Automatic annotation (TrEMBL):
Subcellular location as annotated: Cell projection, Cilium membrane; Cytoplasm, Cytoskeleton, Cilium axoneme; Cytoplasm, Cytoskeleton, Cilium basal body
Entry annotated with the keyword Transcription regulation: no
A molecular function GO annotation: GTP binding
SUPFAM superfamilies reported for this sequence: P-loop containing nucleoside triphosphate hydrolases
Binding positions (GDP): N15, S16, G17, K18, T19, T20, N116, K117, D119, G150
Top-level taxonomic group: Eukaryota
Binding site for Mg(2+) 2: T19, T38, D57
Family the entry assigns: Belongs to the small GTPase superfamily. Arf family.
UniProt cross-references to NCBIfam families, sorted A to Z: small_GTP
Entry GO CC: axoneme; ciliary membrane; cytoplasm
BP terms from Gene Ontology: cilium assembly; intracellular protein transport; protein localization to cilium; vesicle-mediated transport
Protein's name according to its UniProt entry: ADP-ribosylation factor-like protein 6
Positions that bind Mg(2+): T19, T38
Amino acid sequence: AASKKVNVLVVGLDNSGKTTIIERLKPRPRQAAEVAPTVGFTVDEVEKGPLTFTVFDMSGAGRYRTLWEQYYREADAVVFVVDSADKLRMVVARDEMEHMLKHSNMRKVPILYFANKKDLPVAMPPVEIAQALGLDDIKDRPWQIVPSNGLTGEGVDKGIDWLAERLS
Ligand SMILES: Nc1nc2c(ncn2[C@@H]2O[C@H](COP(=O)(O)OP(=O)(O)OP(=O)(O)O)[C@@H](O)[C@H]2O)c(=O)[nH]1
Ligand SMILES: [Mg+2]
């Protein structure tokens, strides 16, 4: 096919803004007014230049986090979303991130980090989120961190463009 099919796995803690950011990737008439917490996971297909993303929108709730690893084997890229305003759980985000990295089915595929909710005045800056998560230690793998506002889409294209370049 003329469109390259790639699997994009979207993870991160509950309430980080995963589902909301994916809505920004859909055609405007297809975007949802409101989103609720994800139950288990759902799937979306989004066209992006020459690529067709099969998006695995995982719940970030603790009861569903064991589902994430069922989709590492076939993931071609990862979008790890973080609530920039949630300083308290950065260390939890980090723990889940490391379990993902160490998993024997996760290959060395690109990771896009969204520092989501940049609009909130309590938002930690991307550089500090990078420090809390230990991202500079990730040397075997392309990665990038971009601040985003999932409500407006600000930063979303910038992050996705970087990811698309990596998968083309
Ligand atoms: N202020 C602000 N709110 C946001 C932003 N992104 C998402 N939200 C809001 O944050 C809440 C959580 O967003 P979701 O997209 O449901 O988060 P999620 O990561 O998919 O949550 P789970 O499915 O439970 O894992 C929703 O009320 C969103 O409207 C943002 O960038 N800024
Ligand atoms: Mg969700």
